[PDB]
Amino acid sequence: TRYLRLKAPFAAFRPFQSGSFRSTTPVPSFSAVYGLLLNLAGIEQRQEVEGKVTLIKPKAELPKLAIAIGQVKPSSTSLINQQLHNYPVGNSGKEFASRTFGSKYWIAPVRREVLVNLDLIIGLQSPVEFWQKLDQGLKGENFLFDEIYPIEKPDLASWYCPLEPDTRPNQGACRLTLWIDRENNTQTTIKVFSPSDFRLEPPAKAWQQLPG
DNA sequence: ACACAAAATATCCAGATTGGGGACACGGTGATAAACATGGA
Numbered sequence: 403t404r405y406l407r408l409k410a411p412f413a414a415f416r417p418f419q420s421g422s423f424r425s426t427t428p429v430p431s432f433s434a435v436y437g438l439l440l441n442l443a444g445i446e447q448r449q450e451v452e453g454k455v456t457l458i459k460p461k462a463e464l465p466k467l468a469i470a471i472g473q474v475k476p477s478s479t480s481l482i483n484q485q486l487h488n489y490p491v492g493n494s495g496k497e498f499a500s501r502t503f504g505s506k507y508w509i510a511p512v513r514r515e516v517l518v519n520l521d522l523i524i525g526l527q528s529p530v531e532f533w534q535k536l537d538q539g540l541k542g543e544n545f546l547f548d549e550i551y552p553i554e555k556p557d558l559a560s561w562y563c564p565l566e567p568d569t570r571p572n573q574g575a576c577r578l579t580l581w582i583d584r585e586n587n588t589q590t591t592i593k594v595f596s597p598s599d600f601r602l603e604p605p606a607k608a609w610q611q612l613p614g
Numbered sequence: 615a616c617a618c619a620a621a622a623t624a625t626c627c628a629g630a631t632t633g634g635g636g637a638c639a640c641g642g643t644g645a646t647a648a649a650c651a652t653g654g655a
Binding site for chain 2 (some may be wrong): 508509
């Protein structure tokens with residue numbers, strides 16, 4: 403129905419299972435977008451549990467919505483190499499096995515990278531109740547978001563759309579994730595996405611319906 | 615203490631000359647360290 407714009411000076415979207423060296427994507431993943439939308443709604447996550455894993459999210463009940471992503475200006479990236487919180491991968495021993503109070507004791511720096519600027523025009527098709535809840539949360543009683551204001555109708559920009567095995571893409575993102583829980587599952591099938599540069603509204607294929 | 619008148623025409627430099635000779639650095643060195651990940655019985 404109605405959509406909104408946002409911007410931020412710095413951002414970072416680390417792909418999962420990156421390993422030692424971290425990376426990022428020019429466009430935030432769908433799951434991160436959904437998490438941001440849920441956080442702004444003022445509704446907490448369905449899971450309240452603590453342990454080895456803390457993403458136990460059954461899909462039994464969750465508001466339905468369709469999400470599109472826009473991009474107005476390409477952004478470069480930079481890298482910083484300071485420190486990282488290592489997880490032991492070797493038998494190791496000594497001091498780590500002595501104290502053992504949330505130890506994470508071994509430390510070794512490698513790398514990581516961040517973005518230079520972010521400005522997106524996010525598109526949402528949601529029921530009226532969810533939009534009203536968002537309005538109440540924004541107006542009522544990690545350097546990721548700076549400010550938000552709905553300027554839907556003006557300020558056109560490019561969009562993204564999945565591509566079928568034909569022709570060739572340009573300036574396309576590497577990987578994208580729809581739904582994921584950090585345990586044994588099938589992850590997501592569709593990975594490749596490409597942008598299209600045209601002024602008017604995105605096509606019907608651009609909108610993607612999230613299972614959650 | 616009254617009135618009247620308060621300059622006019624010619625001319626305002628000419629030559630010769632504006633540097634020459636020698637030299638523009640020599641040696642010695644150009645970081646050194648610590649911070650593991652997988653296999654077979």
